[PDB]
Amino acid sequence: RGSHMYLRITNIVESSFFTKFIIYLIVLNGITMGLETSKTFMQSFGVYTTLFNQIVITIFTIEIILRIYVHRISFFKDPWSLFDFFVVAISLVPFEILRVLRVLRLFRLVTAVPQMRKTVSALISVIPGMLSVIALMTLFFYIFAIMATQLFGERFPEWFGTLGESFYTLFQVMTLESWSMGIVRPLMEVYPYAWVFFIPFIFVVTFVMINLVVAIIVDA
Amino acid sequence: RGSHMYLRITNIVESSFFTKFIIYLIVLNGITMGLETSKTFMQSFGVYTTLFNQIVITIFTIEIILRIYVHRISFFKDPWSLFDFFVVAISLVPFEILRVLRVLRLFRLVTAVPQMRKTVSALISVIPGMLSVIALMTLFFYIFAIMATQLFGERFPEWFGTLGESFYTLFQVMTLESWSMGIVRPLMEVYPYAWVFFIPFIFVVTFVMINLVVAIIVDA
Amino acid sequence: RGSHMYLRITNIVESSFFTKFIIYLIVLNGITMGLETSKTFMQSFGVYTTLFNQIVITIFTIEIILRIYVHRISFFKDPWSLFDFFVVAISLVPFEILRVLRVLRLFRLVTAVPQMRKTVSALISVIPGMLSVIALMTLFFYIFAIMATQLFGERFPEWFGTLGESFYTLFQVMTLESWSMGIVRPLMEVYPYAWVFFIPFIFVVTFVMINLVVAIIVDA
Amino acid sequence: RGSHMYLRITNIVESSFFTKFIIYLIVLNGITMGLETSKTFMQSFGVYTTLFNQIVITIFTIEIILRIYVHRISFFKDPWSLFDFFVVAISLVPFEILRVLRVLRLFRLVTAVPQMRKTVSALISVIPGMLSVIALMTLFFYIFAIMATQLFGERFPEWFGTLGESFYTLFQVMTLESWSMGIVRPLMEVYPYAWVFFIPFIFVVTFVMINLVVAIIVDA
Ligand SMILES: CCCCCCCCCCCCCC(=O)OC[C@H](COP(=O)(O)OCC[N+](C)(C)C)OC(=O)CCCCCCCCCCCCC
Ligand SMILES: CCCCCCCCCCCCCC(=O)OC[C@H](COP(=O)(O)OCC[N+](C)(C)C)OC(=O)CCCCCCCCCCCCC
Ligand SMILES: CCCCCCCCCCCCCC(=O)OC[C@H](COP(=O)(O)OCC[N+](C)(C)C)OC(=O)CCCCCCCCCCCCC
Ligand SMILES: CCCCCCCCCCCCCC(=O)OC[C@H](COP(=O)(O)OCC[N+](C)(C)C)OC(=O)CCCCCCCCCCCCC
């Protein structure tokens, strides 16, 4: 708990060399994961690189293990460690989507470098003051998604045949991407007043967005 | 007016249980209205759900009735109640567009939950300081819509054949959606100087938009 | 100069009735110009409406004449009058583009209604603090327009064959409209490194835009 | 170092006539470079204009030479001169991409006119406070670019077959250009859950952008 061998390990994990080594590895596994992208490189130096990968996964597990010895329950209430935990855990399951999620370990460069932690933490910090407006927005989407599903799903199954599909399309209308040439004008060929649904939608959603952003600037 | 039975009802509508019950119903009729979206679910449990729907419509009418007993003319000068009124009234007419408008009762979650009321009320509050710029903008749209109708409606009836059609297209140009690839470049094949109409339009409309948004930030 | 008949006319133009009458006409000629949009209406009540139009043009010329008697050289240093002048002058030439420009007289509702004048004047007021950045931007466009004309005009004459054409396309890239799917990806089929031209362009132009807008907010 | 002939040259380069002459040339070589765009003009007055071009290149080399005599090592620590240096150097190599880069000398109008220098310098000044967020963003792009390359490169080689290609597409998704109609909806025909990759991408990238812009406004 504060004994002979505890304090030995503690002085290692807390050493700058520990951090730097880990950061050094992250930038290295980073570059390695970008070259693994090339089947040319993969064909030649490929096995070299599978090697470096479990090496790094092992080093990271050892590290995480140590960090829990040194920190115990303090470790499992730290966001930055919990991230490092789950990211490294993912990289330990041997469903290809998990093989790809391995790349999430590169986000450890964020947890590791305090300049980054501080940046991310600044960004995350404005989200709580947004929840109420975001709650309002989601209700809005949900309601309009229902309305659109049953107004247009039958003739327009791809875009609106399903509550989820309508959610997708409504998000696309919010981003303004092809909303008129690709969605609303087609609808109007069948539903001449469809414009009464999407223009108010676009007005509300955009007004909310601007205010949401004025919200952020309301602290500064 | 302040009698024996009046004060009895008053203590019920004003009870927290009343509010919570109503909110409870709203979240329930909400989920129900999302499952009604699926013809699978509709095929199986469908009648169960038509049931829950008039049940809720009845409960809501009773509630609204009570709330007017307790509030009388104060009720009909409250936005939040007037909304609840009109929304529930809609849900009472038996034109499919009214069947769909029933979903508007889910917005009662806004009127009911004071955190939401406050949010919405914040948003709505900035609109009056915008009316003058919005008035200016609409005049602008109207004038340019007339000009475009008669400059391009004859060769381009779909986009500009009608004052309303031109309004629609001009709105789409304002959102910047396909303005060049899908509208102005086609026009230029017939009207080489059409760019003299839409670039200034896009300049004015965008300048106004930014200032409109600086307007909001002019209080904060 | 300040005589018997001068002061008589002066009391008329300066009367509220004068202003209101003019405003009344503007809203009327406004509605009339929107109905002239319909060949149906035009077919039936059409001549009624050509009538109301020169009537109003005459009334407006008389008014402008009076206003110069009452104001003399003060009139020709007022923006709002100079506008009214040029707009009404246009409406007096009998080239269809002038027939359409007649609709610009509806902007007299702006000059006439002081709430509008004040709004417009607020908007116009931020433009001088932008000129320097706008000068920078235009130079930027000019230079990149030259570069693009000679990098891509030969294989891509429609988009870049001409300094003006390149100006048009570059403006479209700035608005982000189809910049990749419709312009840059096509170019890359011939010029694989074209992305080195348009991504920096899009970066600079967007950075400038944001700062231009922060500029406005730098007073507030 | 501060001798007879040194101080003679010094009084010339530091003269207002020197600056004005140079500026005069820049506006002239500017106009000339825009007319060189027309093969009509090129066909007729073309050689006149190749002439004016080396004339100006020579004058500029002489100038730069002088300015280094007058300034020595102070010259090579000035951004504005270093620019003028490299821009003029480019214009001295006789690979067509260098023939086009000659047009970069028009940016000397920026270095020369102090109102511009000040503007540019204002703009550049906000960039250092952005580096941390920009670092975060680039890491984000890199990681998602890797993930997309291996999730979609095989079936969608054009958009994602290569780390660079995925970088390009991800940038396009960030600008929101055709992200749904032209990229994600096509992907979903093969990968129904692709929406789980690009919506969070679009959320993060947009949130960061707004905060990056609130950053700028955080000084004002
Ligand atoms: C005030 C009220 C608050 C209510 C909050 C809770 C809402 C809960 C959502 C309800 C669940 C709806 C699920 C559902 O019906 O799924 C539909 C479809 C699959 O149905 P399926 O039977 O396969 O459709 C057949 C297709 N057809 C018609 C073309 C032949 O599959 C999908 O589309 C999947 C569903 C995706 C959408 C989920 C949206 C969650 C929104 C949360 C809003 C929170 C507001 C605060
Ligand atoms: C300073 C002046 C202020 C004036 C303010 C008041 C303006 C009032 C609007 C005038 C009414 C115009 C109605 C009208 O002409 O409707 C046209 C069309 C249907 O005409 P129709 O005869 O069916 O066209 C035949 C089609 N064709 C030529 C291709 C064979 O149907 C439509 O397009 C319907 C009309 C939709 C547009 C309504 C716009 C309202 C703008 C309000 C601006 C307020 C400014 C403060
Ligand atoms: C520091 C330097 C400052 C210099 C400022 C002054 C610049 C003055 C602009 C120079 C004039 C260029 C005019 C010109 O060459 O016009 C080209 C074309 C028509 O040429 P054309 O001979 O018909 O082309 C034949 C077509 N082809 C090759 C496909 C067979 O026709 C057009 O494209 C018309 C020209 C439109 C563009 C005008 C742009 C003005 C930019 C102002 C920038 C101010 C910066 C502060
Ligand atoms: C925390 C970790 C930090 C790591 C930072 C350092 C990252 C260094 C990047 C790694 C280098 C990757 C180069 C590479 O693999 O190039 C791939 C391709 C050409 O490969 P190739 O063998 O031709 O592909 C064959 C094509 N196929 C499969 C369809 C038959 O060619 C390309 O696509 C060229 C590569 C372009 C992308 C360069 C991106 C630099 C991102 C910098 C991020 C900084 C973060 C702070």
Author numbering:
A (entry chain A), B (entry chain A), C (entry chain A), D (entry chain A): 997 to 1090, 1095 to 1220
Question: Could you pull the original sentences from the published paper?
Answer:
pmcVoltage-gated sodium (NaV) channels initiate and propagate action potentials in nerves and muscles, and mutations in NaV channels lead to many diseases of hyperexcitability. Structural studies of the homotetrameric bacterial sodium channel NaVAb showed that these four homologous domains come together to form a functional channel with an ion-conducting pore at its center. All of these structures have their VSs in the activated state, as determined by the outward position of the gating charges in the S4 segment, while the PM is closed at the activation gate formed by the intracellular ends of the S6 segments.
NaVAb/I119T shows a surprisingly large shift of −37.5 mV in Va. The structure of NaVAb/I119T at 2.75-Å resolution clearly indicates that the side chain of I119T forms a hydrogen bond with Ser132 on S5 of a neighboring subunit (referred to as Ser132′). This distance is shortened to ~7 Å in the I119T mutant structure due to the formation of a strong hydrogen bond (~2.5 Å) between the oxygen atoms of the I119T and Ser132′ side chains. The conformational change observed here disrupts two binding sites for CHAPSO detergent molecules from the bicelles that normally wedge between the S4-S5 linker and the pore-lining S6 segment in the WT structure, such that no electron density for the CHAPSO molecules was present in the mutant structure.
